[PDB]
Amino acid sequence: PPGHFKDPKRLYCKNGGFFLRIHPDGRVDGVREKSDPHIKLQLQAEERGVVSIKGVSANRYLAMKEDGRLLASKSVTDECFFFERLESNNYNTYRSRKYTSWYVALKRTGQYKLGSKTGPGQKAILFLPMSAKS
């Protein structure tokens, strides 16, 4: 099927249909505007099944803090790695390698959802990678 792994991508969240957005100032949220420049991301595997997610424009790496808060730092730390899993429903999920029970997620409002409030059967943790073009 159409596409290539090294190409930057948009991460669409099934919950509300927001694209994951990484702001230049480190804030992480979601928006519906496909034209927004801060939703273009670069996925990079650090090892099998594990990736880092970088907001290209913001030049910051997605990360989940000890309290389940999401944000993006200029420097890569162990809180910037996530197990990428392709679920049976064919969406992707990103679970923190450091805080092994919390997932990257977005609430129906467009704001991120505390990692501590996420779970395997939630609509909020389901993402679909999409081309960053047009």
Binding site: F5, G17, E46, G49, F83, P129, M130
Partner: protein
Amino acid sequence: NKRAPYWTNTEKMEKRLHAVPAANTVKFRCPAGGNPMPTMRWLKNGKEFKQEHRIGGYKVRNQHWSLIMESVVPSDKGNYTCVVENEYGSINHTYHLDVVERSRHRPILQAGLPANASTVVGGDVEFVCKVYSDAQPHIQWIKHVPYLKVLKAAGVNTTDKEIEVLYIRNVTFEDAGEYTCLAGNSIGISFHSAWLTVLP
């Protein structure tokens, strides 16, 4: 209490762009109310949506004001508009559908790559590896010295941008041997090997 059509649950309508994986079912809803009971029509790209417009057609449940398309494919991409009306008014809402094909396979390498190579001591040589993978793949180069040695591995510091080509400069006889491009993703692991021959 006669009145024009109105959306009875705008919450279920806030999600305008529905991006879904191919083969899944898509359901669009426009819960409405009105007196008399308004009629509902669905358009695809601004035009009447007919059953023959897609393989298997579509389904509509009036009680749920919904349009259902099963086993979506890339060609279902487009805009879908619900038009609800009665004698006191007409309103519409538009959804955009996008379909993404997913691949649940371990990484696939191109046959022939990397290719064997030969050179005289002191020369330079490269090994290329082309990978296809939906699940993010992790690529690394290995030398057989099974006693193995990692020469290069993708990551934040060694972007995929330049992980696909391995350069060996000023080759010594010690560089001779089997080189392997190993690609792995959450589903599985794949690898292709090439041999480096060093001549006097």
